[PDB]
């Protein structure tokens, strides 16, 4: 029942952009202060944190490697987290995954989506 459901991967031209979408199924995001972010695994790498959005607090947080280019947003009516990746480069090819952090007094990313591949190439 409770799961992270995602789609939106594909091929993007460097300098352009691609948007990913991860739906919250079995739970709501805003009303429970649940936080949904994105993680990526570039070829040759392990997991890298990309961004997290907290609609209930009105905040977005980012990893240093994507600051200034990637924007994380959410639609609280559609109960969906989105990652808007602008100014993509070949180095950003990765499988992108959505992941769930609940508010806390520790916490962490326990729920994961399936992942989708974002290929950035000319």
């Amino acid at each position: 029942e409770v799961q992270l459901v995602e789609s939106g991967g594909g091929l993007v031209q460097p300098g352009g952009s691609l948007r990913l979408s991860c739906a919250a199924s079995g739970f709501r995001i805003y009303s429970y202060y649940s936080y949904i972010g994105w993680v990526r695994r570039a070829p040759g790498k392990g997991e890298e944190l990309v961004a997290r959005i907290y609609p209930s607090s009105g905040y977005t947080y980012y990893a240093d490697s994507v600051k200034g280019r990637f924007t994380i947003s959410a639609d609280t009516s559609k109960n969906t987290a989105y990652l808007q990746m602008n100014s993509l480069r070949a180095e950003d090819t990765a499988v992108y995954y959505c992941a769930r952090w609940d508010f806390a007094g520790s916490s962490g990313l326990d729920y994961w989506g399936q992942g989708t591949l974002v290929t950035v190439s000319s």
């Binding site: 409770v2 799961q3 459901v5 499988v95 326990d110 729920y111 994961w112 399936q114 992942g115």
Partner: protein, 48 residues
């Protein structure tokens, strides 16, 4: 180690590395849903 059980079951299988994350409570996917599923209320260990 401080928790006593009547039985501990060591369930064993081989999967693709990107599906390791599906052997877990709270998960869905081709392995989590059709091959080997853990309960959301899983109090055990997933070792890979």
């Amino acid at each position: 180690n401080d928790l006593c059980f009547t039985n501990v079951y060591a369930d064993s299988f081989v999967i693709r590395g990107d599906e390791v994350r599906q052997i877990a409570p709270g998960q869905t996917g081709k392995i989590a849903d059709y091959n080997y599923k853990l309960p959301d209320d899983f109090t055990g260990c997933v070792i890979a």
